[PDB]
Amino acid sequence: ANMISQLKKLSIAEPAVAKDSHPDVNIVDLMRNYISQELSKISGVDSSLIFPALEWTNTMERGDLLIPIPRLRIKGANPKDLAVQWAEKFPCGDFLEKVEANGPFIQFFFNPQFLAKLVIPDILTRKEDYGSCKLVENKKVIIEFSSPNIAKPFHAGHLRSTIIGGFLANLYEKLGWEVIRMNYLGDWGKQFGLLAVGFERYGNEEALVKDPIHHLFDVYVRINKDIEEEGDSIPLEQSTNGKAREYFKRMEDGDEEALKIWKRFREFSIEKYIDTYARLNIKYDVYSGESQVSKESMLKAIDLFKEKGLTHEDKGAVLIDLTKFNKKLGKAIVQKSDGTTLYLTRDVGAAMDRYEKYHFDKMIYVIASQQDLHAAQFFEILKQMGFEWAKDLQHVNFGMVQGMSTRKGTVVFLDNILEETKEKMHEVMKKNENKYAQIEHPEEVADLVGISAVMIQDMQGKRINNYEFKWERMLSFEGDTGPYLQYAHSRLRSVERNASGITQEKWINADFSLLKEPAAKLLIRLLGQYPDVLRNAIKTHEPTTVVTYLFKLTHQVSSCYDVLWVAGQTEELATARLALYGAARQVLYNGMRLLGLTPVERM
Ligand SMILES: NC(=[NH2+])NCCC[C@H](N)C(=O)O
């Protein structure tokens, strides 16, 4: 309705549309349709095989898309030969600049001017929706992430889960899904009765509201030191552990104030978190939890366990031998001796709840790889319980952040304190580089840039890999860091030099043929790839791809600054260049937001 329309104007036939491709919002799909249809004619290979066979190129010097011929699986043919042959009689006509042969590979080069005519206009038009696409129709996904425990440490694990999840949610949306961002709070268990008993003994009602997360934490720490100083010959009823297990007796019974106090720990906590998450551009839809598991599903679950015959007691505890389904798993405990539920069981139940409540098409749990088996288990259990949707569950894991524990006394503890230390460290960091700051709101910018630093550093490599939290390296404006993207966005933004509504309009009509410099052709190539980048990332749930793409973008824009000057040029030239810079800035903006960043715009 925009790129295909442009095609009409330019009077160019649209190649056959492969099923599920989206040439309207992804010029690389358009290009894929053209190549498959035309390469299909030369060879005896149906385009349904070529389309998926087209791959990205390691470097832009090897083309835009290529095909390892052997992957086409053509009987008795010499790939080296075919490549040379096809690259010869292959029709570039209006779409490609050239087609080349490199061993058993054939490489395709898009027409830079063709791209410009469609890509720049499309970016400037759809703006913030540029990378968007509807590769999905009426599909709902639940993405559970961060999920800290109340009164307990919000460690690096939670942080990491928080960052990946926030991004996965944004990604899933720009790709057409309906997203339910859920935060499965750790807010139940004997530990809360203890907490309740502790708030009584050392708690302050005013401190609870001023700072629920910190106060409750400090309260928990204190009530524990009592549990230790006791334990011996102390009436195991007037003891702390006693009143804890007793005060917890509110799961069987109701109100008894036993809940009024707890429901406030939870709600006041959630109210604080909401502001904190806002700094990471995350707004949860549902603040669920282990406590929020329906009594119905919990019982229905324990029930179905036997109805299917998976249970088998041992030492007085109920277990499920997943061995026969996957030796890698094991005899998972679902109910211990004292006839009480476990962490694994609350997850089995919570799933059951979430399904009947949302009837999701897919559910994603962003949990550390430390809990791999945990997930793998209640996934295999939900399966044997019959529930079909179990196949629609997925565990997106990740390695651990190391050396982050800045708290000189222990592990990082409170999320907001993290943001704060980052901001502080980035503030004095900004102070040391007189060349970058002249801003009016240092503090504010510091927070945004600081958070940018944390996010980028965390998403640079694969999720599964352990990475070192390096204050020095991450806050710097040097290498491929968060601050680097921010300052780049800022420079690009300034280059647009106030783009009136009517101005961005003349950009759309600029004479792109004036963008003949190679440095420009490379950026244009690059800009057309954003939609494909997102498409690939949801396929892997790896933000690296995006982060790597955004740095290639800023670096190319950097190369362009040296040659594609705007000031002092004729109007026609300046307009064609600014159109490019603007489209470039738009993509950069989009990509950063997707990752969870807040592009610094107002200095
Ligand atoms: N459904 C889940 N198990 N979500 C993740 C829970 C993580 C847990 N709160 C922890 O701190 O380890």
CSV table of C-alpha atoms in Angstrom, one decimal, residues 423 426-427 430-431 437-449 603:
chain,number,residue,atom,x,y,z
A,423,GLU,CA,23.4,7.1,36.5
A,426,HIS,CA,27.7,7.9,34.0
A,427,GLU,CA,27.1,11.4,35.3
A,430,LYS,CA,30.0,12.7,31.4
A,431,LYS,CA,31.8,15.3,33.5
A,437,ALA,CA,28.4,17.7,27.2
A,438,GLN,CA,27.0,21.2,27.1
A,439,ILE,CA,23.5,20.0,28.0
A,440,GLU,CA,21.0,21.7,30.3
A,441,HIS,CA,19.7,18.5,32.0
A,442,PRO,CA,22.9,16.5,32.8
A,443,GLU,CA,21.2,14.3,35.5
A,444,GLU,CA,18.3,13.4,33.2
A,445,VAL,CA,20.5,12.6,30.2
A,446,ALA,CA,22.9,10.6,32.5
A,447,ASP,CA,20.0,8.3,33.5
A,448,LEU,CA,18.9,7.7,29.9
A,449,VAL,CA,22.5,7.2,28.6
A,603,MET,CA,19.5,18.1,25.6
